[PDB]
Write a protein that binds this ligand. Sequence first.
Ligand SMILES: NS(=O)(=O)c1c(F)c(F)c(N[C@]23C[C@H]4C[C@H](C[C@H](C4)C2)C3)c(F)c1F
Ligand SMILES: [Zn+2]
Length: 257
Amino acid sequence: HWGYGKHNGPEHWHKDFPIAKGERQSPVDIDTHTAKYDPSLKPLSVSYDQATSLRILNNGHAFNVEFDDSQDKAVLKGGPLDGTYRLIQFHFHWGSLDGQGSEHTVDKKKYAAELHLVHWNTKYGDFGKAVQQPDGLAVLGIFLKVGSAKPGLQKVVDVLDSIKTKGKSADFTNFDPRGLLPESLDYWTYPGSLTTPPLLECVTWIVLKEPISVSSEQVLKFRKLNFNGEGEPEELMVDNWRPAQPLKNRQIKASFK
Ligand SMILES: NS(=O)(=O)c1c(F)c(F)c(N[C@]23C[C@H]4C[C@H](C[C@H](C4)C2)C3)c(F)c1F
Ligand SMILES: [Zn+2]
């Protein structure tokens, strides 16, 4: 039922998922000026050398590129984190126009898109158990602006025509997610939630300060995807972002400056 239109969009979610109005919801605006520098935060450790991509799926809200998370193959650790978190999937949120699309904002600025690399805490044994814990997930957010092409994203953009409608999937092996990372790993971090229903408050958010650049043609291709299934009327998959939620009683920490 939930989605991103007039009648079922983010402002409606709280009726099915009352946690929508809770104490640690995501995304948020990152006020760069009041984020607290913390010299005790560690560098983020991104170990994606052994990543195994498997498949790409249109799930009706975004597309996910999924990874084999049955061993420690692509993990995030360090940064603000105490455990090891295995990469299970990545996906993006984007706009109908280049002026919007990101979920997090930086001093109210919206980016054309936002990449989410979703990871789960190995201590809880799998993803479904991890989302029930307050430290279950670590999601690495990376902003996308439009400019030069990101060569490392092109394999993804090139397969989207094969998964146009909700429910379609395609084999997607040997995709290297290191080709989506900007140069710097400087980050902000705060405690928050999944940004889609069920909106579970299980996420340590780690948002990179440095955006990656993607070409207008790349992001144009995201916008050719569909929310609807193959049988049905065409609703373009655009503006699948939740806007910024109240920070409430939370402090955003910065690994830098
Ligand atoms: N935007 S996000 O990074 O906060 C995010 C996830 F982290 C996610 F893990 C997911 N995936 C799930 C898969 C399934 C279990 C939960 C709830 C639903 C169904 C969405 C998480 C998701 F859709 C999502 F948008
Ligand atoms: Zn997301």
